[PDB]
Design a protein around this ligand. Structure first.
Ligand SMILES: [Mg+2]
Ligand SMILES: [Mg+2]
Length: 314
């Protein structure tokens, strides 16, 4: 059982973005990168940037900061009803960021009164609930910590009613995250990457912030220390998963298990992925060259929540 590999042509899009992680298309087809970077001394110096795709030129729209504590934004999703970005920050929690660069911190505490943990990945379901991974410890002003060895990583659901609910915990560095939907649009499965354990986990989604039947859903190949990072579904509900401790993007079928195909990259350390809406084009961030690339996949992406806005014919 050798896993078949393809080597499509990758094209460089932009470069020199230290930590280039989360990326997203907004409702105008503009492209954003979050850059969870620090300065030499270690002070957070996170950034959210917009990329001109015909030129690769970059524009910093936001340097998140709260009480002089800098952000480490890592993951991002675009909203549906308003063109605004929900941003998962490893120092600041969940931010909502306008295209005009202004932002709001969403929650200092969760629904049980606990201080919020720093967040990394997030995925809207089609009902507008945001599922979030939190591999960091408490948000600032607490000292930064990371569940790369100890199991204090957590999962949240930020519901359409405005509740920040912790739905599971005791993960070792949860990273990427995605929601599988049935053909009729109902959220069905939550998939969570547990980065250093090489596991992808699945839950049955029974409602807003109600998940159960947790199980190991997929295995990430590779012998290195870090496995899965970012992930996204294609329109057939194949899950593409950046394998950080490698030069590959893994492709799982709807049934999980072992990858049914691997995509070899011209670089190590793939981090985040995102389809361009209505195209087969996948954008990939990677931390060997701190750069962004694109390549063509075999079919279009699964529509993100922000693509599901509909309007009465009147
Ligand atoms: Mg649990
Ligand atoms: Mg993505």
């Amino acid at each position: 059982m050798e896993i078949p590999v393809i080597e499509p042509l990758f094209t460089k899009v932009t470069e020199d973005i230290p930590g280039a992680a989360g990326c997203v298309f907004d409702k105008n087809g503009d492209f954003y990168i979050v850059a969870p970077a620090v300065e030499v001394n270690g002070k957070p110096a996170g950034e959210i940037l917009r990329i001109d795709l015909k030129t690769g030129k970059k524009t910093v729209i936001c340097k998140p900061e709260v009480n002089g504590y800098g952000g480490i934004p890592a993951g991002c999703q675009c909203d549906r009803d308003a063109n605004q970005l929900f941003v998962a920050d490893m120092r600041l929690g969940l931010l909502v960021v306008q295209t005009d660069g202004t932002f709001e911190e969403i929650a200092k505490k969760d629904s049980e009164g606990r201080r919020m943990q720093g967040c990394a990945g997030c995925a809207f379901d089609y009902e507008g609930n945001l599922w979030i991974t939190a591999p960091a410890g408490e948000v600032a002003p607490a000292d930064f910590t990371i569940s790369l060895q100890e199991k204090f990583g957590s999962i949240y659901c930020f519901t359409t009613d405005g509740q920040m609910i912790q739905v599971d915990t005791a993960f070792q560095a949860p990273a990427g995250i995605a929601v599988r939907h049935m053909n009729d649009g109902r959220p069905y499965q939550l998939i969570v990457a547990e980065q250093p354990t090489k596991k992808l986990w699945s839950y049955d989604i029974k409602g807003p912030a109600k998940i159960e039947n947790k199980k190991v859903w997929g295995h990430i190949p590779g012998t290195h220390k870090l496995g899965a990072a970012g992930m996204d579904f294609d329109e057939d509900n194949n899950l593409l998963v950046a394998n950080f401790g490698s030069s590959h993007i893994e492709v799982f079928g709807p049934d999980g298990g072992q990858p049914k195909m691997r995509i070899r990259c011209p670089f190590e350390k793939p981090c985040a992925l995102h389809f361009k809406p209505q195209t087969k084009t996948i954008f990939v961030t990677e931390l060997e060259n701190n750069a962004v690339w694109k390549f063509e996949w075999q079919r279009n992406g699964k529509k993100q929540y922000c693509e599901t806005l509909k309007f009465g014919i009147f």
